[PDB]
Design a binder for this molecule. Structure first.
Ligand code: CLA
Ligand code: CLA
Ligand code: CLA
Ligand code: CLA
Ligand code: CLA
Ligand code: CLA
Ligand code: CLA
Ligand code: CLA
Ligand SMILES: CCCCCCCCCCCCCCCC(=O)OC[C@H](COP(=O)(O)OC[C@@H](O)CO)OC(=O)CCCCCCCCCCCCCCC
Ligand SMILES: CC1=C(/C=C/C(C)=C/C=C/C(C)=C/C=C/C=C(C)/C=C/C=C(C)/C=C/C2=C(C)CCCC2(C)C)C(C)(C)CCC1
Ligand code: SF4
Ligand code: SF4
Lengths: 165, 75, 75, 144, 733, 64, 40, 80
């Protein structure tokens, strides 16, 4: 398979790893009674463990010789072989949220610079104003492009202080 | 104080353990602290007649074991 | 200063006080190795730091694994 | 105004002494003498540590460096409203009056003073170091 | 006033212990000396370079002499696999009898040190076979050392001092150095390989006494003058050749086998002869490029003036840079250090993976020491390159003479450069550290399957392109139906493909998620070190905080507590900060190299593949596990030959920690303390009869930074050297 | 008469000034012929904590 | 009340509330969707 | 000795002179500023280089500048 890896569903090491993890919990479960709270907690952990190994194999992760899932980061390989949900799709999930936070903060900063005392709005947050901007940040990718195309995203060099050179 | 350790590290590295400051070599016994321990271990006999035992087992005497482990013993 | 004080206390108690008591006698946690090893810097690095750090660096996967994480976090 | 003359006979403030005073530098290189007139007996702090009592009238103290004399001058001027002066005394007996240089303290502009080390330009108008390279020693562009 | 130093009258009149310290520190900063002129500066540098050359050759003479006198080179050549090379003999009256016995090893009569420098493998590969060879070489290099020392004296004499214009003839020097110093030297080394080294590797002795009657090839120069150059590639050494003997030997002198010698597991001597012959031709031709007294060639100034993009994207382009570079010794030294610094790293990266010397690969300690040795030297050299780049901007740069060219335009967007370097460093730091910490938590909770393991597909793809069939990409040299595979299938691909698909050597080692994480750690180190060094250079002349910084020079304490406080504001201090990061970066690089080879050498690469994805794995399995033999070099029960490394290991920790004193506690505290000692001495009877000539003072602010860094750096290096050697040789010694 | 009007906005052109390329408000303009008659006040303090400085006539240009 | 709600709008208090909310959201997602390593 | 220079941006506020712990500076008549006085540095042989004067200067950039130079007993602040 990709880069000599093998699917985790077909990996002997992957299957062996699950047995060891469950075996460790089973050993601890012997010293407790069937209905006792420690027994219930240990079995709940065992159910989660079995579900975890079942889900990762179902998702089609590739496993190395160690039996551990390995992620695929090249967009071409990820999209060609159905690994887009490992790095590629998460990539755009992050950039949407990260830009959301950045864009909302930038809007608040610009909004309060027109006030009488801008610095007072940075240590005592204008929560009504902050809340309104938070909800409107869901469309930042559209808003950001329009500023880029309108020439208003960036400031002109003549207004930026620099040191002597 | 720290120089004595450096002396000991160097002698040990050079294979001259007989030249080290140690119990089996040049000795540096804390005789004053040893004397104080003996006095406190013998206090019940003479200088604390109404005390059954010494204040602490670190002075000397017999160890106390609880649950198969040492609670305290002479140091 | 206080780092050495507590290292002194930790090694001395393990070596010469704490231990298990059986018919054969008292077996201390580190087997009384303070007297002959604690007089060199290499003794402290080897017999105290390197040897006794085995527990913390091997705690991953156990209930003590939180101390392994904090050990690295504190470094 | 004229330069005062030091009077070595002047009594010194009541003080039991300390380990913070003069060293061998005073015997071989130079030391400093500060004198002032006190309106009343009063306790002040020695720059070398401890409390001393200034005698009513003339007072005289000796110090190891110029900053010590001026440190006591600042205390006396601001906390007691006095007007001290001090000298530099060389081992061979020569005395050099120092402060106030012309009888008027420097913070007050006085006529007859000639400007020194005054550049008729801004800092930003100094030349680049490459222009003073190989001038005979290490020198900044601010030295021209 | 005091005589010393003669070059600084300001220092000579300093009445404190400052003067002796600064007399030493400023001794080689010629530009700052009293009465220095530009022409005298160049002549002083020229003489100093002769001094360096004689020292280097004397140092090489000493190594040859001691191996011949006290080594076991003759015994080593009979069985290089099972004999440890001897560096020199030990004579230490402080040793006890057990130490005398412990260090008596390698067949020598008395105590000796084992060589880790690899000179045995190098000298053996080039034809040296007996102690007489080493002795003669030693005497020859001592003579060459004396000649260079004399030449340095000679060119200081009135009739032998070159003029300033001689030193500024760039075109002539480049021609001679490219064709003569690089080309002819490479051609001469080819002659040695063809006439001596290659015959010696085939069991034939060729020396000064008979080299004029021994044909390097059965057909002597007939193929060379008739164009039948393929006659020299016929009958190469067979796969069964025994190095140093005539068994299985060939007759070729110039080949392109392109792999490793099966026995020595190093490069073929006939490939190394053809390499230098081709390099010699390239460099000889390259040295006929620039104009001299013969009316042909290029003028370097003309080339630079011409390369200006028409669109104006680089402004004036390279106009004025000939004078800028030619008139600045610091611009030249910055370029030289950057070029040599990168070349040193290339030497490290290529020598371990393509071992040129016979039986180098199997000497694990030598392999580790050489890679670590040259990578640390590269790291220091790179810091110097940027240091002298910052010195250039202050002392030598002229804004008026560089108006609008590429150099002046770098200063115009320095904020853009620094802020983007800052972004890259932040991104790498947050996410590389984050992934390691995520994997440590997954390991701690007993769920290694939940850790984030990103396959290095981009690097594995490059390895496949080179012919590594493990990953299954199968293109270029990994695809048997590609034109690249077919075209080279008769020249070098068979040897190369055999070597690259053997997982028992260091040629393109297999890589995985553990290699992915550490490579991004290295990128973090390179970018952060560059950020500090670049910021230091570009702000060297001034900042918003200190607009007139260039008026204060390269190195100065600070600008005082005003304007918020200005500690470590000088460009010199930026370099001081950068060295810590250079040491950290090289430390990460060498830890990576060492651990990956230790597990390969032990036949268990899985330990690295599984432990390197989280940081407790590095702490537990690399450092803690491999310290056991080192720290037992001596103990209450005895000592062994690793006691010297055990002692040096702690020696390194001690110096390292002493450096923390100078870095953390600063001057004012100490100056007050020394004053009480001054008072005490003058008041003590029988001791105040003695007195100092230099008034004691605490070290200066700048001096503390340098001394503290020196202790930090020396302890850093010694600690690792002891660990590297002891953990490797103890395992494989 | 000389210099910008009081209360107007100006842009600083002195390269070594903390407020280079920034905008301040004119406080007063000395008419006595001093070297730096224009007094400017700024919203943001410099590293020393100062918010007012003196400039020459050619070191200030009307904002916008 | 105006002043008290002004106090609750200071940076440390807002940071406490916002990070308590953000942490709660991330913890509760992992409670109902345990051991997420990839997107499916 | 250290090098102290006064530049023509001085406003004659006298704060550098008041802050000097060594009495290196003084005020002299001038006509280039409204205060009609400029700072002067007549006695630089006594400057220790503390830079308290620079801390006290209100102008931007500074009007009084100290460049640390050769070290003597006076400039080093030694009392021995
Ligand atoms: C960060 C740099 C980087 C690197 C080193 C690679 C490397 C690779 N990519 Mg990837 N790729 C990247 C970024 C990168 N990619 C990005 C940012 C994108 C999104 C725009 C893609 C989109 C992409 C696609 C769509 C494909 C690859 C493919 C490949 C592999 C073979 C093609 C090749 O020669 O690529 C070398 C890379 C470069 C010279 C840089 C530009 C690469 C472009 C964007 C893709 C070229 C595709 C190529 C023409 C396909 C040929 C046919 C294929 C069957 C071999 C190779 C391992 C191919 C593959 O093997 O898919 C399974 C493939 O089909 N990549
Ligand atoms: C409005 C918030 C905001 C925005 C939009 C940006 C944007 C940027 N920053 Mg900056 N930054 C911010 C806040 C912000 N920053 C803060 C608070 C700090 C102090 C910790 C920094 C410290 C900082 C550094 C040190 C660097 C940047 C850099 C950058 C650039 C690259 C992105 C990056 O590296 O981010 C990294 C982001 C951080 C290090 C801090 C982010 C902290 C949070 C998430 C920001 C929002 C908090 C705020 C209170 C929200 C208000 C909401 C409102 C409704 C009340 C980019 C221009 C880099 C640069 O110059 O690249 C060229 C760079 O080197 N920033
Ligand atoms: C053919 C004539 C010639 C030759 C042979 C040289 C030779 C030299 N000149 Mg030059 N020079 C010449 C003409 C020549 N010059 C002319 C005409 C002028 C006037 C225009 C000058 C002006 C001049 C100056 C002003 C200076 C020199 C200097 C030098 C020395 C440089 C330092 C050194 O040792 O580098 C050694 C370099 C090499 C061996 C070349 C290879 C470098 C690579 C990168 C190393 C790696 C190769 C290989 C892998 C190494 C294997 C190692 C082994 C352990 C396995 C060198 C001896 C400098 C010096 O030191 O003077 C005392 C110096 O300051 N020259
Ligand atoms: C600089 C290196 C060098 C030197 C000094 C020598 C020297 C020698 N070689 Mg060797 N050789 C070398 C490189 C060298 N070789 C290389 C690179 C190869 C591989 C191609 C060989 C292959 C080789 C063979 C196969 C043979 C020799 C032979 C000889 C010997 C007789 C040559 C003769 O009769 O020439 C007479 C030829 C001429 C007078 C004309 C020479 C014309 C060329 C173009 C001169 C170029 C000079 C050059 C630019 C300057 C270099 C530096 C200078 C100080 C030498 C002689 C001792 C022969 C011998 O008998 O060895 C025992 C012999 O059979 N050599
Ligand atoms: C070809 C190489 C080269 C050359 C010719 C120069 C030349 C110069 N450099 Mg540069 N430099 C270089 C490489 C070079 N450098 C490198 C590699 C670095 C990075 C490390 C630097 C970093 C650097 C800085 C930061 C500075 C210079 C400066 C200078 C100048 C003065 C040097 C001086 O007086 O030193 C005097 C040297 C000493 C007093 C000895 C220093 C000893 C060090 C700290 C190591 C000590 C090791 C210790 C003794 C080991 C003990 C071991 C134990 C077991 C016993 C001079 C023009 C200075 C300058 O002002 O330039 C204008 C300056 O500030 N250089
Ligand atoms: C292990 C020690 C260490 C660490 C972690 C750092 C980290 C950093 N250094 Mg520093 N540095 C160190 C030692 C260290 N340095 C030493 C010994 C020196 C020599 C004096 C320097 C000298 C130095 C210089 C000169 C520079 C740096 C720079 C940097 C940054 C590099 C980019 C980066 O990693 O961004 C990512 C950031 C990090 C990895 C930092 C840790 C972030 C943590 C994990 C956040 C955790 C938050 C979490 C919610 C917990 C908060 C708890 C709290 C509220 C109680 C970063 C902030 C450069 C810089 O600023 O670049 C922009 C820079 O110029 N360092
Ligand atoms: C568990 C998941 C996780 C976590 C906790 C983090 C955490 C972090 N990431 Mg990371 N990241 C992740 C996953 C994660 N990342 C993944 C899966 C990817 C894809 C490979 C990335 C890619 C990524 C990038 C590219 C960057 C980070 C950055 C950051 C740091 C600052 C974020 C910030 O302040 O945003 C608040 C936002 C701001 C302060 C300003 C905006 C910053 C964003 C990143 C710009 C996005 C631009 C967007 C693509 C639009 C382009 C312009 C156009 C529309 C006009 C922070 C420590 C930033 C960093 O390290 O900066 C030094 C950064 O630049 N991350
Ligand atoms: C670079 C930093 C980094 C990155 C990229 C990750 C990434 C991840 N970590 Mg790890 N982690 C890190 C640092 C990092 N971690 C550190 C420093 C620590 C120590 C505190 C941990 C401790 C840790 C634990 C204990 C766990 C993780 C887990 C996870 C996963 C969480 C996925 C999730 O909640 O999806 C939820 C889905 C989302 C979409 C989240 C965002 C929700 C908003 C509403 C989306 C809005 C979209 C419009 C993910 C693979 C968990 C796991 O299962 O890993 C396999 C897990 O149990 N991490
Ligand atoms: C759109 C449709 C598709 C085709 C687009 C073609 C665009 C062509 C470019 C025009 C873009 C353009 O207008 O360029 C303009 C500018 C060239 O400036 P000049 O002043 O020299 O020339 C302007 C000319 O347009 C007219 O003279 O170049 C750039 O800014 C980028 C050059 C990229 C050069 C690429 C090669 C760089 C290699 C560097 C080393 C790499 C080493 C590592 C890898 C081996
Ligand atoms: C600051 C400064 C300075 C300094 C600088 C420095 C220090 C730098 C460095 C730099 C560096 C350090 C750089 C480097 C670079 C590199 C590169 C650029 C590379 C490239 C490469 C390539 C291109 C390759 C290719 C290839 C491959 C990859 C494979 C196959 C083959 C071939 C060849 C094709 C100076 C003095 C100037 C002065 C001014 C200022
Ligand atoms: S540096 Fe200090 S001593 Fe010198 S003039 Fe300024 S305030 Fe006075
Ligand atoms: S503090 Fe500055 S502006 Fe004021 S008198 Fe001194 S130099 Fe002039």
């Amino acid at each position: 398979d990709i880069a000599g890896l093998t699917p985790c569903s077909e990996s002997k090491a992957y299957a062996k790893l699950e047995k060891k993890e469950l075996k460790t919990l089973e050993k601890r479960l012997k010293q407790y009674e069937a209905d006792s709270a420690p027994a219930v907690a240990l079995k709940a952990t065992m159910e989660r463990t079995k579900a975890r190994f079942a889900n990762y194999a179902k998702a089609g992760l590739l496993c190395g010789n160690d039996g551990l899932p390995h992620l695929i980061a090249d967009p071409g390989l990820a999209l060609k072989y159905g690994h887009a949900g490992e790095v590629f799709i998460p990539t755009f999930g992050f950039l949407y949220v990260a830009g959301y936070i950045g864009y909302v903060g930038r809007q608040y900063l610009i909004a309060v610079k027109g006030e009488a005392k801008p610095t007072d709005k940075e240590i005592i947050i204008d929560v009504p104003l902050a809340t309104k901007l938070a909800w409107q940040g869901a469309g930042w990718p559209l808003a950001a492009v329009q500023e880029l195309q309108r020439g208003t995203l960036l400031e002109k060099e003549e207004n930026i202080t620099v040191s002597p050179r | 104080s720290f120089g004595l350790y450096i002396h000991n590290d160097t002698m040990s590295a050079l294979g001259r353990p007989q030249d080290m400051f140690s119990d089996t070599a040049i000795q540096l016994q804390p005789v004053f602290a040893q004397w104080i321990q003996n006095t406190h271990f013998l206090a019940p006999q003479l200088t604390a007649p109404n005390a059954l035992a010494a204040t602490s087992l670190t002075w000397g005497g017999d160890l106390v074991a609880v649950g198969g482990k040492v609670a305290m013993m002479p140091i | 200063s206080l780092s050495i004080v507590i290292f002194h206390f930790s090694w001395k108690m393990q070596s010469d006080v704490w231990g298990t008591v059986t018919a054969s006698g008292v077996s201390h946690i580190t087997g009384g190795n303070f007297a002959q090893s604690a007089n060199t810097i290499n003794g402290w690095l080897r017999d105290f730091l390197w040897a006794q750090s085995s527990q913390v660096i091997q705690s991953y996967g156990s209930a003590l694994s939180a101390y392994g994480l904090i050990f690295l976090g504190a470094h | 105004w004229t330069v005062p003359t030091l009077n070595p006979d002047t009594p010194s403030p009541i003080f039991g002494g300390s380990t913070g005073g003069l060293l061998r530098k005073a015997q071989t290189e130079e030391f400093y003498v500060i004198t002032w007139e006190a309106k009343k007996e009063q306790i002040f702090e020695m720059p070398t540590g401890g409390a001393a009592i200034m005698r009513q009238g003339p007072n005289l103290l000796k110090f190891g460096k110029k900053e010590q004399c001026l440190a006591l001058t600042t205390q006396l001027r601001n906390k007691f409203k006095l007007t001290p002066c001090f000298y530099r005394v060389f081992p061979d007996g020569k005395v050099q009056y120092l402060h106030p240089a012309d009888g008027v303290y420097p913070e007050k502009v006085n006529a007859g003073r000639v400007g020194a080390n005054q550049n008729m330009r801004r800092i930003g108008q100094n030349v680049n170091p490459i222009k003073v390279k190989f001038s005979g020693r290490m020198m900044s562009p601010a030295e021209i | 006033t005091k005589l010393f130093p003669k070059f600084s009258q300001g220092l000579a009149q300093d009445p404190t212990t400052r003067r002796i310290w600064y007399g030493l520190a400023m001794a080689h900063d010629f530009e700052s000396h009293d009465g220095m002129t530009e022409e005298n500066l160049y002549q002083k540098i020229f003489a100093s370079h002769f001094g360096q050359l004689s020292i280097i050759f004397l140092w090489t003479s000493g190594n040859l002499f001691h191996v011949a006198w006290q080594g076991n080179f003759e015994q080593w050549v009979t069985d290089p696999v099972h004999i440890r090379p001897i560096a020199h003999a030990i004579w230490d009256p402080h040793f006890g009898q057990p130490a005398v016995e412990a260090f008596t090893r390698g067949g020598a009569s008395g105590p000796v040190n084992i060589s880790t420098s690899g000179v045995y493998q190098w000298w053996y590969t080039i034809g040296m076979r007996t102690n007489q060879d080493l002795y003669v070489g030693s005497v020859f290099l001592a003579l060459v050392s004396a000649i260079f020392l004399f030449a340095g004296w000679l060119h200081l004499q009135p009739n032998f001092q070159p003029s300033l214009s001689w030193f500024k003839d760039a075109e002539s020097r480049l021609n001679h150095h490219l064709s003569g110093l690089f080309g002819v030297s490479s051609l001469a080394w080819t002659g040695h390989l063809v006439h001596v080294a290659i015959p010696e590797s085939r069991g034939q002795h060729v020396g000064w006494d008979n080299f004029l009657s021994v044909l390097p090839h059965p057909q002597g120069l007939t193929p060379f003058f008739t164009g039948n150059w393929a006659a020299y590639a016929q009958s190469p050494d067979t796969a069964s050749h025994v190095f140093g003997t005539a068994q299985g030997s060939g007759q070729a002198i110039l080949t392109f086998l392109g792999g490793f010698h099966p026995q020595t597991q190093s490069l073929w001597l006939t490939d190394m002869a053809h390499h230098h012959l081709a390099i010699a031709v390239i460099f000889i031709v390259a040295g006929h490029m620039y104009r001299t007294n013969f009316g042909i060639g290029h003028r370097m100034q003309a080339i630079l003036e011409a390369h200006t993009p028409p669109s104006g994207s680089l402004g004036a382009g390279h106009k004025g840079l000939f004078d800028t570079v030619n008139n600045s010794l610091h611009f030249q030294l910055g370029l030289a250090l950057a070029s040599v610094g990168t070349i040193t790293s290339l030497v490290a990266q290529h020598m371990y993976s393509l071992p040129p010397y016979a039986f180098q690969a199997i000497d694990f300690t030598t392999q580790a020491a050489l890679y670590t040795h040259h990578q640390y030297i590269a790291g220091f050299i790179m810091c110097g390159a940027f240091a002298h780049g910052a010195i250039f901007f202050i002392r030598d740069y002229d804004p008026e003479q560089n108006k609008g060219n590429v150099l002046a335009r770098m200063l115009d967007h320095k904020e853009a450069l620094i802020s983007h370097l800052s972004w890259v460093s932040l991104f790498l730091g947050f996410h590389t550290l984050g992934l390691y910490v995520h994997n440590d938590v997954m390991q701690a909770f007993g769920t290694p399957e939940k850790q984030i393991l990103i396959e290095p597909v981009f690097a594995q793809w490059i390895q496949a392109a080179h012919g590594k069939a493990l990953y299954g990409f199968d293109f270029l040299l990994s695809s048997k139906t590609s034109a690249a595979f077919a075209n080279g299938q008769s020249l070098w691909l068979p040897g190369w493909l055999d070597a690259i698909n053997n997982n028992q050597n260091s040629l393109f080692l297999t890589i995985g998620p553990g290699d992915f994480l550490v490579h991004h750690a290295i990128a973090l180190g390179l970018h952060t070190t560059t950020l500090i060094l670049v910021k230091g250079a570009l702000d060297a002349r001034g900042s918003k905080l200190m607009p007139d910084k260039k008026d204060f020079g390269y190195s100065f304490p600070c600008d005082g507590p005003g304007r918020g406080g200005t500690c470590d504001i000088s460009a010199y201090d930026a370099f001081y900060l950068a060295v810590f990061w250079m040491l950290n970066t090289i430390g990460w690089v060498t830890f990576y190299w060492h651990w990956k080879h230790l597990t390969l050498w032990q036949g268990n690469v899985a330990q690295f593949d599984e432990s390197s994805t989280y940081l407790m794995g590095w702490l537990r399995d690399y450092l803690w596990l491999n310290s056991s033999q080192l720290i037992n070099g001596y103990n209450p029960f005895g000592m062994n030959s690793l006691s010297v490394w055990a002692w040096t290991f702690l020696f390194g920790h001690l110096i390292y920690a002493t450096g923390f004193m100078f870095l953390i506690s600063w001057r004012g505290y100490w100056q007050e303390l020394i004053e009480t000692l001054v008072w005490a001495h003058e008041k003590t009877p029988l001791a105040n009869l003695v007195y100092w000539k230099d008034k004691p003072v605490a070290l200066s602010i700048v001096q503390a930074r340098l001394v503290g860094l020196a202790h930090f750096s020396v302890g850093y290096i010694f600690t690792y050297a002891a660990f590297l050697i002891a953990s490797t040789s103890g395992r494989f010694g | 008469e000389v210099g910008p009007k009081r209360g107007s906005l100006v842009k600083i052109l002195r390269p070594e000034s903390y407020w280079f390329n920034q905008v301040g408000k004119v406080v007063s303009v000395d008419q006595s012929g001093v070297r730096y008659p224009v007094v400017v006040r700024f919203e943001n303090q410099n590293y020393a904590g100062v918010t007012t400085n003196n400039y020459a006539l050619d070191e200030v240009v009307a904002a916008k | 009340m105006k002043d008290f709600t002004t106090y609750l709008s200071t940076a440390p208090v807002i940071a406490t509330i916002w990070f308590t909310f953000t942490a709660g959201l991330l913890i509760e997602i992992n409670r109902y969707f345990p051991d997420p390593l990839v997107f499916s | 000795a250290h090098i102290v220079k006064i530049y023509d941006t001085c406003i004659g506020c006298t704060q550098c002179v008041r802050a000097c712990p060594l009495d290196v500076l003084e005020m002299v008549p001038w006509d280039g500023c409204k205060a009609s006085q400029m700072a002067s540095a007549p006695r630089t042989e006594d400057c220790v280089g503390c830079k308290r004067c620079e801390t006290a200067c209100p102008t931007d950039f500074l009007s009084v500048r100290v460049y640390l130079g050769s070290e003597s007993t006076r400039s080093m602040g030694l009392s021995y």
